[PDB]
Specification:
mucus; part of a larger assembly; about 100 residues; binds 2-acetamido-2-deoxy-beta-D-glucopyranose; structural protein; about 35% strand; mainly beta; four-stranded antiparallel beta sheet; 1 chains; epithelia; Fc fragment of IgG binding protein
Length: about 100
């Protein structure tokens, strides 16, 4: 239980994995940052979870940055954009 790690995503993008690994992958449409077991192998007492992000260019083909971040757990999807407020609820209504 004491074990705890993090995925550190740095804009302009640069990724730091849970394990110690860094790379400079870039993309243009939404990707699966993390989620449940895609093959469904060795899962006990699993709970749904999925975090996905979307990237796009900013003026040069070779650079991409993060625009929106989405999560989805327990029949509840949370979406965040660059608007300083929530916009998180299932319907997508803006929230404080
Ligand atoms: C990992 O467990 C919780 C989960 O976020 C966190 O608050 C805590 O600070 C972390 N503990 C350690 C030892 O890294």
């Amino acid at each position: 239980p004491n074990y705890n790690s993090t995925c550190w995503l740095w804009g302009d993008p640069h990724y730091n994995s849970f394990d110690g690994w860094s790379f400079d992958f870039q993309g243009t449409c939404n990707y699966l940052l993390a989620g449940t077991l895609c093959p469904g192998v060795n899962a006990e007492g699993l709970t749904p979870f999925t975090v996905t992000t979307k990237n796009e260019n900013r003026g040069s083909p070779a650079v991409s940055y993060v625009r929106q971040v989405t999560v989805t757990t327990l029949n509840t999807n949370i979406s965040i954009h660059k608007n300083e407020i929530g916009k998180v609820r299932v319907n997508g209504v803006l929230m404080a």
